[PDB]
Amino acid sequence: HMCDAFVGTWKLVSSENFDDYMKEVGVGFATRKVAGMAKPNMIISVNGDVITIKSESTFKNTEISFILGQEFDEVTADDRKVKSTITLDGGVLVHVQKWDGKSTTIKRKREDDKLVVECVMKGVTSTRVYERA
Numbered sequence: 120h121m122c123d124a125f126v127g128t129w130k131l132v133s134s135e136n137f138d139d140y141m142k143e144v145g146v147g148f149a150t151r152k153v154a155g156m157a158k159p160n161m162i163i164s165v166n167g168d169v170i171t172i173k174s175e176s177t178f179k180n181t182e183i184s185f186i187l188g189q190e191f192d193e194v195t196a197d198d199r200k201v202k203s204t205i206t207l208d209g210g211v212l213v214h215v216q217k218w219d220g221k222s223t224t225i226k227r228k229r230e231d232d233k234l235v236v237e238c239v240m241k242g243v244t245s246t247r248v249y250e251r252a
């Protein structure tokens with residue numbers, strides 16, 4: 120019952136400072152443009168201890184399956200090969216990605232009827248808001 124309030128299909132409704140976040144991460148111009156246009160659906164499901172997060176869009180489709188606290192490999196939408204760990208901290212899903220001596224953290228929180236996603240790279244934070252589809 121760990122992630123019950125996250126489970127479902129969520130559609131992106133707003134984004135703020137994603138371009139800057141992507142620049143900070145090292146994403147090149149053309150990928151920033153196309154990725155920034157996308158309005159992904161985020162599909163979250165749980166089966167036993169395994170959480171699956173799918174992102175489906177016109178740009179890319181991604182899928183991760185993981186157990187909380189257990190590191191895994193992920194290829195991101197912008198093609199970084201990262202080592203990821205996702206944990207729950209006070210009801211927030213905290214996703215850290217490590218690659219090339221760098222790190223980024225992505226936090227997913229339920230707030231009212233939205234799922235709010237904060238992505239931080241160094242001093243740059245982006246906020247993406249999703250609503251139920």
Ligand SMILES: O=C(O)c1[nH]c2cc(Cl)c(Cl)cc2c1-c1ccccc1Cl
Pocket residue numbers: 140141144146150151154155157158159174175176178179180181195196197
């Ligand atoms: O959804 C996400 O988890 C997500 N995380 C990102 C990190 C970076 Cl740096 C960039 Cl370029 C893009 C993404 C995406 C994304 C953005 C648009 C469509 C599909 C997807 Cl998957």
